[PDB]
Recover the amino acids of this structure.
């Protein structure tokens, strides 16, 4: 599972432990071992959401499976919750794109997961 | 709809108003209220297009619907037009990836659009 | 074909000529003229892989065709090879997402490749 968050929130406002918390909570949510979870936080971005530049985030979650109607609603509750708590971003200023990747289309360690 | 542009054009060459113009014009082009539209501009990137580091851009437009053959051609004319006028990037050094997102695969406000 | 590398490796550790090398190597690998190839390297990122912030990379390869089970395995060996050789990133700390793009969903030069 790979989670990326792009946000206009300043780097200094990203708290200690945020990548670790994301990793741990994604492990819990996706059922995957933390050793295979990747997280990427990109602060200080030039962004607007609804035409304004109050704190916002554009995110993506890629996963081989564990993507679907109910699962994505659960991820969104979790991830918006963390963004609101830790980065003070309102959940209604967050988009998260979910991608169900075919194992043959994810490269790792000189090969793919197929 | 979410629009991201990554470019090697420096920050100082991004004109005032650019995020707002992108928002307005995307609202016009997609027929969606600007409150729905997110835009993200990433300047100063280490990029090459055709092996050359002349100004270029790699972009994406994700949308829940309003993606298709003719529509994408129209978006490309619009967006290349804006990048050429505002950032002085040649349209033949622009790629724009279009993604038709399922509502269930876009999170927002603790849930999804499903 | 468009190749993006996001990494926590510092900018200074990205060798001169890396973008050109990626371009030439992808050109050979995809059997496409280098004029078609775009590359984007993003160093100094705040990233974790497996809960660790040792050097790692999250990458994507978008291509109109030339994506598939065996081809992706070949790309992974190639690209992990380059990342290990040039950026000193272990191949088991690299993910590469492969995307087979429809021609109608790639904008270029005021239109699309449709
Ligand atoms: S995207 C993200 N990760 C990329 C693919 C992860 C496969 C998990 C392997 C694995 C999963 C569960 C139990 C044992 C091993
Ligand atoms: S991405 C951008 N903005 C997000 C739009 C959320 C409302 C989708 C409406 C909608 C749902 C289903 C089919 C067509 C339209
Ligand atoms: S992404 C990268 N470079 C962009 C490629 C533009 C020409 C597509 C040719 C092409 C069209 C249809 C099927 C196969 C090949």
């Amino acid at each position: 599972p790979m989670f990326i968050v792009n946000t206009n929130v300043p780097r200094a406002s990203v708290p200690d432990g945020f990548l670790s918390e994301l990793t741990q909570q994604l492990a819990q949510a996706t059922g995957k071992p933390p050793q295979y979870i990747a997280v990427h936080v990109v602060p200080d971005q030039l962004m607007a959401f609804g035409g304004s530049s109050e704190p916002c985030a554009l995110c993506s979650l890629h996963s081989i499976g564990k993507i679907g109607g109910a699962q994505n609603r659960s991820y969104s509750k979790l991830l918006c919750g963390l963004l609101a708590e830790r980065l003070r971003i309102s959940p209604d200023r967050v988009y998260i794109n979910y991608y169900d990747m075919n194992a043959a289309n994810v490269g790792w360690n000189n090969s793919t997961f197929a």
